[PDB]
């Protein structure tokens, strides 16, 4: 749940000379004293309970363990990591509204992928290199990079379709129906020579994926809202 995480860091106190038959560790109070505490500014103290632990199967083991339940203050990492990540992710769907004549689809999608990969690597450098769990922010970034790779492939296909002319390609009837009569009606396009017919087919293809990505990237808040 980083950067909205709560840590549980313990402090175990024993005598490394005398066992239970020689000394008995006892707690003066059931919590650690905060009578002269200096607040952190990055971490919040939630609870500092102390517990005296014995071993029923040892009889020579005693320890006093404190649990430091600390809660991170998330404003710093929110501002410096989560807002930039959301800003970059919001650019993942623009490639499907960019006209193919602009000649800049590849630039946009590749830049988005590069930024997401960089943010993923930075997050990796922040958190410990443990394999027990993945940060939800890391999972969301990874899902977005998979989507952006899919978008790069789709944009390559759309660009290939856009630059087709009667002198090089022939439009099969199944295309002339599916992508010029049926689908445009579904997506509320309403088409108003043949070289321009190929241009429209590309326009329909990337309009379809604009809808798909919006639903996937709006239901992608179900994987982000669950964090805070």
């Amino acid at each position, epitope marked *: 749940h980083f950067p909205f995480d709560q840590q549980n860091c313990t402090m175990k106190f024993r005598s490394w000379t005398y066992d239970r038959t020689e000394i008995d560790l006892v707690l003066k*109070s*059931e*919590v*650690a*004293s*905060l*009578d002269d*505490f200096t*607040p952190s500014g990055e971490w*919040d*103290i*939630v*609870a*500092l*309970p102390g517990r005296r632990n014995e071993n029923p199967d040892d009889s020579t083991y005693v320890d006093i363990t404190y649990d430091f*339940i600390i809660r991170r203050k998330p404003l710093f990492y929110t501002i410096n990591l989560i807002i930039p990540c959301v800003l970059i992710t919001s650019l993942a769907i623009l490639v499907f509204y960019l006209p193919s004549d602009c000649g800049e689809k590849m630039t946009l999608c590749i830049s988005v992928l590069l930024a997401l990969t960089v943010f993923l690597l930075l997050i990796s450098k922040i958190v410990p290199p443990t394999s027990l769990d993945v940060p939800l922010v890391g999972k969301y970034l990874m899902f977005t990079m998979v989507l952006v790779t899919f978008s790069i492939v789709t944009s390559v296909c759309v660009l290939n379709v856009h630059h087709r002319s009667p002198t090089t390609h022939t439009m099969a009837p199944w295309v002339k129906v599916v992508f010029l009569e049926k689908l445009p009606a579904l997506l509320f396009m309403q088409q108003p020579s043949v070289s321009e017919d190929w241009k429209y087919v590309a326009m329909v293809i990337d309009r379809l994926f604009l809808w798909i990505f919006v639903f996937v990237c709006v239901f992608g808040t179900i994987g982000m809202f669950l964090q805070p």
Partner: antibody
Amino acid sequence: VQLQQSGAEVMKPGASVKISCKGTGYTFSSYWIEWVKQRPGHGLERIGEILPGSGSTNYNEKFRGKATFTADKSSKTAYMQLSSLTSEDSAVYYCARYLPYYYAMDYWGQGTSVTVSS
Amino acid sequence: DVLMTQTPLSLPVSLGDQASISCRSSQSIVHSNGNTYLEWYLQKPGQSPKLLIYKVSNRFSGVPDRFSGSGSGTDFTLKISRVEAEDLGVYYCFQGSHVPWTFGGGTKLEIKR
């Protein structure tokens, strides 16, 4: 262990009152102090909490801005200030000792009664 | 804010009759440590609430054994085996799992005759 609250208060609308809760018999600075409102009608509403050791405080959205918590470590007392008193603020206010994820609200104050009227 | 709902709002039961209060959560209040932090409070008239149960089942030191709790997920219930005149009051839920921590609606327990 014992939590002692201030006496009953009567205030005019638009004024502000400052209730106090004094804890003795335990590590005062290491336990959260939960403030609970109980209108004469019914219901227990949690105003918020403060950890006297640090300055950390939390407020329920319904009371954010209405109530402010402060703590004095020297004298083991925690204070709540209610601003812009109105008729609906007339109720009995309790202070309780809480340690999240651990020992629960086992000890409560006697309850301070506040009435808002002219 | 997790919403905690208690039913029935009123539960008339005669002396010696088992009582059962039910308590619902807007969302699961389970916690990673293996415990779900639900607490039951009784407030007799003109008195501060008294802790009865914490962590669903654990009974606070000094409460009669007739009280018992149980549940999981978003369903929890409190059972009083053999009610008694001193059991009269309002019983409240309290979830200590997700910040902020909220109280239940309350279930006024009365005796029928």
